[PDB]
Design a protein around this motif. Structure first.
Motif, PDB file in Angstrom:
ATOM      1  N   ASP A  45       0.766  -1.236   0.000  1.00  9.94           N
ATOM      2  CA  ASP A  45       0.000   0.000   0.000  1.00  9.94           C
ATOM      3  C   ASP A  45       0.795   1.282   0.000  1.00  9.94           C
ATOM      4  N   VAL A  46       1.989   1.231  -0.563  1.00 14.09           N
ATOM      5  CA  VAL A  46       2.854   2.406  -0.605  1.00 14.09           C
ATOM      6  C   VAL A  46       2.536   3.396  -1.734  1.00 14.09           C
ATOM      7  N   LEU A  47       2.022   2.883  -2.857  1.00 16.74           N
ATOM      8  CA  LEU A  47       1.727   3.708  -4.023  1.00 16.74           C
ATOM      9  C   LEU A  47       0.393   4.434  -3.984  1.00 16.74           C
ATOM     10  N   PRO A  48       0.314   5.544  -4.699  1.00 15.96           N
ATOM     11  CA  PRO A  48      -0.875   6.398  -4.807  1.00 15.96           C
ATOM     12  C   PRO A  48      -2.038   5.688  -5.501  1.00 15.96           C
ATOM     13  N   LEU A  49      -2.535   4.615  -4.913  1.00 18.11           N
ATOM     14  CA  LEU A  49      -3.657   3.891  -5.487  1.00 18.11           C
ATOM     15  C   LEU A  49      -4.977   4.643  -5.282  1.00 18.11           C
ATOM     16  N   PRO A  50      -5.927   4.510  -6.218  1.00 16.40           N
ATOM     17  CA  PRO A  50      -5.877   3.720  -7.449  1.00 16.40           C
ATOM     18  C   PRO A  50      -5.040   4.447  -8.496  1.00 16.40           C
ATOM     19  N   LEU A  51      -4.313   3.671  -9.303  1.00 16.83           N
ATOM     20  CA  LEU A  51      -3.459   4.236 -10.335  1.00 16.83           C
ATOM     21  C   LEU A  51      -3.334   3.338 -11.561  1.00 16.83           C
ATOM     22  N   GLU A  52      -2.747   3.889 -12.605  1.00 15.58           N
ATOM     23  CA  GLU A  52      -2.538   3.127 -13.810  1.00 15.58           C
ATOM     24  C   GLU A  52      -1.088   3.297 -14.223  1.00 15.58           C
ATOM     25  N   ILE A  53      -0.453   2.187 -14.602  1.00 12.54           N
ATOM     26  CA  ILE A  53       0.934   2.201 -15.067  1.00 12.54           C
ATOM     27  C   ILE A  53       0.887   1.964 -16.583  1.00 12.54           C
ATOM     28  N   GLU A  54       1.420   2.888 -17.369  1.00 10.70           N
ATOM     29  CA  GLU A  54       1.440   2.706 -18.810  1.00 10.70           C
ATOM     30  C   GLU A  54       2.849   2.453 -19.317  1.00 10.70           C
ATOM     31  N   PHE A  55       3.035   1.330 -20.001  1.00  4.35           N
ATOM     32  CA  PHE A  55       4.319   1.011 -20.621  1.00  4.35           C
ATOM     33  C   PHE A  55       4.199   1.426 -22.085  1.00  4.35           C
ATOM     34  N   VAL A  56       4.990   2.414 -22.480  1.00  3.24           N
ATOM     35  CA  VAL A  56       4.931   2.940 -23.836  1.00  3.24           C
ATOM     36  C   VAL A  56       6.208   2.786 -24.691  1.00  3.24           C
ATOM     37  N   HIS A  57       6.010   2.666 -26.004  1.00  2.00           N
ATOM     38  CA  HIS A  57       7.086   2.517 -26.985  1.00  2.00           C
ATOM     39  C   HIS A  57       7.861   1.243 -26.788  1.00  2.00           C
ATOM     40  N   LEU A  58       7.144   0.192 -26.419  1.00  2.00           N
ATOM     41  CA  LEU A  58       7.772  -1.086 -26.186  1.00  2.00           C
ATOM     42  C   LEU A  58       7.501  -2.002 -27.364  1.00  2.00           C
ATOM     43  N   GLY A  59       8.557  -2.362 -28.084  1.00  2.00           N
ATOM     44  CA  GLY A  59       8.390  -3.241 -29.224  1.00  2.00           C
ATOM     45  C   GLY A  59       8.742  -4.678 -28.908  1.00  2.00           C
ATOM     46  N   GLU A  60       8.536  -5.530 -29.900  1.00  2.00           N
ATOM     47  CA  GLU A  60       8.824  -6.959 -29.834  1.00  2.00           C
ATOM     48  C   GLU A  60       9.933  -7.419 -28.904  1.00  2.00           C
ATOM     49  N   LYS A  61      11.165  -7.162 -29.314  1.00  2.00           N
ATOM     50  CA  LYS A  61      12.316  -7.600 -28.558  1.00  2.00           C
ATOM     51  C   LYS A  61      12.379  -7.023 -27.156  1.00  2.00           C
ATOM     52  N   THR A  62      12.134  -5.731 -27.050  1.00  2.00           N
ATOM     53  CA  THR A  62      12.202  -5.094 -25.754  1.00  2.00           C
ATOM     54  C   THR A  62      11.098  -5.595 -24.815  1.00  2.00           C
ATOM     55  N   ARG A  63       9.909  -5.821 -25.349  1.00  2.00           N
ATOM     56  CA  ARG A  63       8.813  -6.364 -24.550  1.00  2.00           C
ATOM     57  C   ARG A  63       9.328  -7.698 -23.950  1.00  2.00           C
ATOM     58  N   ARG A  64       9.959  -8.505 -24.807  1.00  2.00           N
ATOM     59  CA  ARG A  64      10.498  -9.807 -24.440  1.00  2.00           C
ATOM     60  C   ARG A  64      11.615  -9.681 -23.394  1.00  2.00           C
ATOM     61  N   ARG A  65      12.539  -8.747 -23.585  1.00  2.00           N
ATOM     62  CA  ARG A  65      13.615  -8.592 -22.620  1.00  2.00           C
ATOM     63  C   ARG A  65      13.082  -8.185 -21.261  1.00  2.00           C
ATOM     64  N   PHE A  66      12.020  -7.374 -21.247  1.00  2.00           N
ATOM     65  CA  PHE A  66      11.407  -6.884 -19.996  1.00  2.00           C
ATOM     66  C   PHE A  66      10.201  -7.703 -19.561  1.00  2.00           C
ATOM     67  N   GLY A  67      10.142  -8.948 -20.023  1.00  2.00           N
ATOM     68  CA  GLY A  67       9.032  -9.838 -19.711  1.00  2.00           C
ATOM     69  C   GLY A  67       8.762 -10.122 -18.251  1.00  2.00           C
ATOM     70  N   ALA A  68       9.810 -10.137 -17.433  1.00  2.00           N
ATOM     71  CA  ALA A  68       9.645 -10.377 -16.003  1.00  2.00           C
ATOM     72  C   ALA A  68       8.836  -9.207 -15.437  1.00  2.00           C
ATOM     73  N   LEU A  69       9.211  -7.982 -15.811  1.00  2.00           N
ATOM     74  CA  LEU A  69       8.497  -6.775 -15.360  1.00  2.00           C
ATOM     75  C   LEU A  69       7.036  -6.767 -15.789  1.00  2.00           C
ATOM     76  N   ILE A  70       6.801  -7.136 -17.047  1.00  2.00           N
ATOM     77  CA  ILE A  70       5.447  -7.181 -17.570  1.00  2.00           C
ATOM     78  C   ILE A  70       4.681  -8.255 -16.848  1.00  2.00           C
ATOM     79  N   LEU A  71       5.349  -9.350 -16.493  1.00  2.00           N
ATOM     80  CA  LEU A  71       4.662 -10.423 -15.790  1.00  2.00           C
ATOM     81  C   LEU A  71       4.283  -9.942 -14.394  1.00  2.00           C
ATOM     82  N   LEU A  72       5.237  -9.321 -13.719  1.00  2.00           N
ATOM     83  CA  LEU A  72       5.028  -8.803 -12.379  1.00  2.00           C
ATOM     84  C   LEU A  72       3.845  -7.842 -12.345  1.00  2.00           C
ATOM     85  N   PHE A  73       3.830  -6.876 -13.248  1.00  2.00           N
ATOM     86  CA  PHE A  73       2.716  -5.932 -13.270  1.00  2.00           C
ATOM     87  C   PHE A  73       1.333  -6.501 -13.628  1.00  2.00           C
TER      88      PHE A  73
END
Length: 90
Positions: A45-73
């Motif tokens: 409960d540390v974050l300013p909820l309710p909120l929205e996190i937007e991941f922008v300009h993420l393409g194929e390879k980069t989406r894949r490299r940051f997959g752990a983060l995307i999974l976590l969110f």
């Protein structure tokens, strides 16, 4: 309700993320350094909820490299009864 954006044209490592994240939510030094510490903050409960996190300009390879983060969110969203919204660009 609070909308935050992460532009991946400016993030290249996961380390870049943690820092941009901390900077964006005014979090201290290394309150978020790895996946587990990011997860705690999303769970304690540390974050300013309710909120929205937007991941922008993420393409194929980069989406894949940051997959752990995307999974976590997606899981934080599943766990936070929609109080946290997560969206990747298009």
């Amino acid at each position: 309700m609070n909308i935050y954006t992460f532009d991946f044209d400016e993030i290249e490592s996961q380390e870049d993320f943690y820092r941009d994240f901390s900077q964006t939510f005014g979090l201290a030094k290394d309150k978020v350094r790895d996946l587990d510490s990011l997860w705690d903050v999303l769970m304690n409960d540390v974050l300013p909820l309710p909120l929205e996190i937007e991941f922008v300009h993420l393409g194929e390879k980069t989406r894949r490299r940051f997959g752990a983060l995307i999974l976590l969110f997606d899981e934080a969203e599943e766990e936070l009864e929609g109080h946290l919204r997560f969206n990747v660009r298009h």
